Paper text:
Gabija is one of the most prevalent anti-phage defence systems, occurring in more than 15% of all sequenced bacterial and archaeal genomes, but the molecular basis of how Gabija defends cells from viral infection remains poorly understood. Bacterial Gabija defence operons encode the proteins GajA and GajB, which together protect cells against diverse phages. Gabija protein A (GajA) is a DNA endonuclease that tetramerizes to form the core of the anti-phage defence complex. Two sets of Gabija protein B (GajB) dimers dock at opposite sides of the complex and create a 4:4 GajA–GajB assembly (hereafter, GajAB) that is essential for phage resistance in vivo.
To define the structural basis of Gabija anti-phage defence, we co-expressed Bacillus cereus VD045 GajA and GajB and determined a 3.0 Å X-ray crystal structure of the protein complex. The structure of the GajAB complex reveals an intricate 4:4 assembly with a tetrameric core of GajA subunits braced on either end by dimers of GajB. GajA is a class 2 OLD nuclease, with the Toprim domain containing a complete active site composed of DxD after β3T (D432 and D434), an invariant glutamate after β2T (E379) and an invariant glycine between α1T and β1T (G409). The structure of GajB reveals a superfamily 1A DNA helicase domain. Comparisons with UvrD and Rep show that GajB protomers in the GajAB complex exhibit a partial rotation of the 2B domain relative to 2A–1A–1B, consistent with a partially active conformation that is poised to interact with phage DNA. GajA tetramers form through two highly conserved oligomerization interfaces. First, the GajA N-terminal ATPase domain contains an insertion between β7ABC and β8ABC that consists of four α-helices (α1–α4D) that zip up against a partnering GajA protomer to form a hydrophobic interface along the α2D helix. The GajA ATPase domain contains a second oligomerization interface in a loop between β6ABC and α6ABC, in which hydrogen-bond contacts between D135 and R139 interlock two GajA dimers to form the tetrameric core assembly. Major GajA–GajB contacts also occur in the GajB helicase 1B domain, in which GajA R97 in a loop between α4ABC and β5ABC forms hydrogen-bond contacts with Q150 in GajB α7 along with hydrophobic packing interactions centred at GajB V147. Notably, the GajAB structure shows that the GajB helicase 1A subdomain, which includes the DEXQD-box active site, is positioned adjacent to the GajA ATPase domain, suggesting that GajB ATP hydrolysis and DNA-unwinding activity might regulate the activation of the GajA ATPase domain.
Numbering used by the authors:
A (entry chain A), B (entry chain A): 0 to 171, 181 to 201, 206 to 221, 225 to 246, 259 to 575
C (entry chain A): 138 to 171, 181 to 201, 206 to 221, 225 to 246, 259 to 284
């Protein structure tokens, strides 16, 4: 359902052989800053006439090897031709280069072979329906048929608004203009109305065989300079405001593709969210490619493809089609802001709530305070299932770790029925179906602390029944507690928790106020306590997060 | 206890009259990008010889008025002279410009008066112990005594490592060097060992009345070019790695001041945290001024002064000495990451946990989804008191709003005693002392849901007793619920909550699993429900957050 | 000397004539230092430009786009804000304009630097 299928880059700079799936809206990010920039340049060379005329240098070839040929192919999908207007744009120019047998697909390729004597390898653009017999894109002079289809707008991080406005002023009443024109000449008559015009001529005439020297603008009219005025960081957003209005009117007849590199540069965090809303929520930017290091620039992300360039020197690329389902729509904004910062990390530990974050932040601080520097990240997920977070992180090649409590949820409208919520979420990551809800018989005289302890006994009983299902969880880096985190914490530092709280049952007291008591616990936690919790088998997720 | 007291900027560019307190480590941020840049330039003009020799242009004067004089004064504190080594650095150069009566203070001023005929206003640097009779800083030629005290290192956002390395190579064995030197000459003898050297001379000699042409490096030795090699974004951190080692050895005899502008540019989020740890935790950067738009660059902030430039055109500056107390040290990293993003907002709503964030994000989405674009922010605080967050936001001129539940906490080691935790935190913001803990008599047969309902009756009773104390909370934008959020939510949409949950007591069912049930609630919440919750008097904090 | 100037800078003013020079750029340096009832009519007429320029579809649509993006966008025209004197570049009635730059230097330096020795 997207015109842009995938792009292939062969032997171009650090790209040995890289295949990346695509969509209308694409966002690229990762550690390799060189790979992200070369990715945008590889798209410009294929589609931007100004950057393509310069040809390939020796450095652009992969590993500076001129024998290997540079090849950049863009695969397109024309299946939605019946209801896509921009698809008909491409068809009208391609004409007979398509075949009816493969009418759904169309290829746009860039081939380059290097000449030693000419010290210069030219760029030959081919297209066609079949990848085997691509034909040269027809052209006459400095323009070809491809330049009539696609117009590439590259938004530099740093831009002067007055300079770009001078480019758009020309194309963007008459009886009124005539009065302004005659009045413009009225300026020059009053300016001359005098001692300098006559003395510079007497000096010029003796020097060289009328020197009036009027004033600019009045010669060419008021339209020559019409720079804007509002009523550094603020004017950057007005340049985007010009781009939206300009490109639609100027390039309505062709497909416009935006290449936005690092737009968060010299931009406030609040404006980054404003730009993110305009990129995804608004239909103003139909097709763009975005390179960003800013998590706040993805707060409003939806219906986009996320491309992650790996930190390795091989320049491996992992792409994910990020789409928020309608069921998650009521918590979409909360979910995106938490996941946006996790895309840039290397290992993400899925925790439930803030009480786990308060504990883990203190424990990690004593054991390994540089865990975020090396790519670790604590992502808290509350109320929702793990599938949306795991699918996005898995496709992007990000190591995901899950630590959740074994919980039971009472079904509404019926008493005595409890859903196996803790197991179902871990089973959902493995693709298995939700387990049947169970009914446990608790007497009416058993309430409060006595009631909770009996429910814990069912959790331990349920945990033992699915002993093999837990075995599959550990292979998938899923860590399901027997009862909950507080009981696993008691197993690691029971002597410390009893001394810290002086209460004979520290687990019961910790769960009274989970946030406050966890803060009270971490304040009195010893350094050996943090190492004991870290080294304990029940907390293997902390060892997997640091990556030892 | 800090050498840098405050700085005064008068009639310099957009700074009409601005007074900013300072410390050794300073971070500046805000909407006004022009004010932050002019703030760093105002410091360079006072202390950087290279930027000071160019003098003041007409544009540098405030509102382009040359009548008003530009004045930049830096107030210093020399009280810690007995134990501060860098203080003795300044004393050794100032010599007799200090008086013993005001020995604790020293002024460094920049005065500029404009000449119409000379079209140029020079920079006159004065210093002295008394602000009334400042004396010209002694100098001879292009250097003065102040250039011997302070060395300003300005770190540009974009820097080439090889170029800065060429500046530091000179100042950073012999029998080994002698073998490398003779071997270097061995290159040239083997290079000549020939057809080009004789033919270009035959052409040159006929053209003009020996043309051997050897090879660079071999003439000046191997030390001329020694560029580094490791075994774009990665090399930026190595440039900082050079700066730490270079500046300490090169400028050990003088006070080095770093001016770092927008270092998050072209830097990964993980490296920003690495740089933040080096700025605050490490003692490598004793004195610096930091301009940043990145919240991740303040994850490790501590013992620094936060300067916030207001969004207004008057360029108002609010400064806060941010310091984390020892009591908050066990949750310092968790607290900083939440507060770092709140410094850049304009209105911050302090909520307790994520269940409040899940609800507020959905409600705000329907009512005002652009609330973060206009400066709103939801900051969740769990387990800790509000004083640390409110003091930082209040000093920076950021509107702070607090919404918390009226809670009771059981004291450890004793039953029947409950602390008025909900009221104490709101009283702590007003400066009042903690209230005396109360004891409520609950029978042993009353447990579970019946026990919670009796405790709610005490909360309503406690709420009515302190009816006037709640009145002072509303003036301070403190919103204390009578019982909790769930009961206030029932008051706003009771009909909707009963229909959504089908349970006769939706408040009791919502509190069973606060996270999951809140997600279940917001999914079925109507648009009119969000407007009813927003318009209700119990949720006036949402109206104060958007700023209507 | 005091600051960036010394007594020698008050005696001698050095004019360095580069082989390649743009006349319009050097003229912008000398325009400031080189009647009133006439200037007042030119000034009011300069404001008469801006009133007739706005007299309209772009000023309202860019604001609707800006206001939704960020919490009036009229955008007039340069020169009319600072007056006619901001840009007054010359016009005669590459090699020829080089001699006119010397023609400016002779007249400029004598009036501007009459009080000091010009080299």
């Amino acid at each position: 359902s997207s015109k842009f299928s995938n792009i292939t880059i062969k032997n171009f700079r650090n790209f040995e052989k890289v295949n990346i799936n695509l969509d209308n809206k694409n966002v690229i990010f990762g550690m390799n800053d060189i790979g992200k920039t070369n990715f945008l340049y590889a798209l410009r060379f294929l589609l931007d006439k100004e950057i393509r005329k310069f040809g390939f240098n020796k450095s652009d070839y992969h590993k500076h090897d001129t024998s290997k040929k540079i090849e950049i192919i863009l695969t397109l999908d024309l299946s939605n031709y019946e209801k896509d207007e921009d698809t008909k744009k491409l068809i009208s120019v391609v004409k007979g280069a398509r075949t009816s047998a493969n009418a759904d697909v169309f290829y746009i390729a860039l081939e380059s072979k290097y000449d030693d004597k000419e010290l210069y390898g030219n760029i030959i653009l081919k297209w066609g329906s079949e990848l085997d017999n691509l034909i040269d894109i027809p052209g006459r002079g400095n323009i070809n048929a491809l330049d009539n289809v696609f117009k590439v707008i590259y938004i530099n991080p740093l831009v002067d608004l007055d300079k770009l406005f001078a480019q758009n002023k020309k194309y963007i009443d008459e009886g009124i203009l005539n009065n302004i024109k005659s009045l413009t000449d009225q300026v020059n008559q009053q300016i001359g109305e005098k001692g300098f015009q006559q003395e510079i001529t007497s000096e010029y005439r003796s020097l060289k065989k009328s020197i009036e020297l009027k004033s600019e603008m009045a010669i060419k009219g008021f339209f020559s300079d019409i720079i804007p005025y509002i009523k550094d960081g603020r004017r950057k957003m007005l340049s985007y405001s010009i781009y939206n209005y300009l490109a639609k009117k100027k390039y309505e007849d062709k497909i416009v593709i935006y290449l936005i590199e690092e737009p968060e540069i010299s931009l406030h965090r609040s404006m980054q969210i404003a730009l993110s809303k305009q990129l995804f929520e608004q239909s103003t930017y139909k097709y763009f490619f975005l390179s960003t290091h800013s998590p706040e620039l993805l707060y409003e992300m939806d219906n986009t493809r996320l491309i992650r360039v790996h930190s390795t020197e091989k320049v491996v690329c992992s792409s994910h089609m990020y789409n928020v389902e309608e069921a998650y729509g009521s918590v979409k904004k909360k979910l995106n802001k938490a996941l946006s910062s996790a895309l840039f990390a290397e290992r993400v530990l899925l925790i439930e709530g803030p009480s786990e974050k308060i504990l883990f932040e203190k424990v990690l601080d004593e054991v390994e305070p540089e865990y975020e520097l090396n790519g670790g990240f604590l992502l808290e997920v509350g109320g929702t299932y793990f599938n949306h977070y795991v699918c996005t992180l898995n496709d992007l090649g990000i190591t995901h770790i899950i630590k959740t409590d074994n919980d039971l949820k009472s079904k509404k409208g019926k008493k005595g029925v409890y859903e196996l919520l803790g197991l179902n979420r871990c089973l959902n990551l493995l693709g298995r179906e939700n387990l049947d809800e169970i009914t446990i018989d608790i007497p009416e005289d058993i309430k409060g602390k006595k009631k909770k302890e009996r429910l814990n006994e069912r959790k331990k009983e349920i945990f033992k029944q699915y002993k093999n299902e837990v075995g599959e969880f550990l292979g998938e880096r899923i860590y399901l507690s027997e009862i909950d985190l507080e009981n696993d914490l008691y197993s690691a530092i029971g002597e410390s928790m009893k001394r810290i709280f002086e209460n004979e049952d520290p687990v019961h007291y910790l769960q009274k106020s989970k946030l406050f008591n966890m803060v009270e616990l971490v304040n009195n936690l010893s350094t050996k306590d943090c190492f004991d919790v870290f080294e304990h088998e029940k907390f293997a997720c902390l060892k997997e997060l640091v990556g030892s």
